[PDB]
Curated annotation (Swiss-Prot):
Keywords: Oxidoreductase, tRNA processing. The gene is trhO. It comes from the Bacteria. The active site is at 187 (cysteine persulfide intermediate). Belongs to the TrhO family. This is tRNA uridine(34) hydroxylase. Residues 133-227 form the Rhodanese domain. Catalyzes oxygen-dependent 5-hydroxyuridine (ho5U) modification at position 34 in tRNAs.
Amino acid sequence: GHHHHHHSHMVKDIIIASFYKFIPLNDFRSLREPILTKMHEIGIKGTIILAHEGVNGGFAGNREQMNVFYDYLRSDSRFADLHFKETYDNKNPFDKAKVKLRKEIVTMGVQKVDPSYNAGTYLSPEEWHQFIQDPNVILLDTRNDYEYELGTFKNAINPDIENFREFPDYVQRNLIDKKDKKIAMFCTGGIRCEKTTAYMKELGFEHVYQLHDGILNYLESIPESESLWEGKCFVFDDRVAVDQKLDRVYPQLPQDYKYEREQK
């Protein structure tokens, strides 16, 4: 019933969820207090970002805690189908519960980017695996410089940006003459590519593709022996990065990360 100690079958019994959803939230400001209160009651640590355009977050707890909190979030009909993508550790990688209100759930700094009309641009990990072996594909990391340096897909280009809002300028100065080229984009869990792909499609890019649910989805789906992933995958929490097995890198990476998704 949740009030009895019963250790998980797993040694890594802390669940770390990552999620996002683009859906208009007219009352998004009024959701902050109820969600935050439930995090406090249940003992969830993590950061959830709310905006008019939707929700994004990462948070952690044991299975009993996640059962209660998933159910709570999903009790809003607009969130009934939130997909919590899980990785696991033996430590909670978040220091406290935070809910932030923002202009965007991930800040690219461009006014009318509609991530609807992204239909046809998503590649599953299996499709992606085949797609990005083509040396003629422009394989483009959408992540920040600190992320790229820890690890990336084989042959991936680094846009060398400090913040996601620098991405449109990168497109404008580097890719505008390449609208008819195959361009494949990826990030940690998919959220940034939702905006980059929509933004570029509108600009007239005809062959832009994005890795569905990002690097973490690929690492879970593709066996390590075949994987085109190199190095470690940066994450926006205490773990700093995870390896191909989606485990916290050991020994622990320096935690001047810096972390949370608001800096992204």
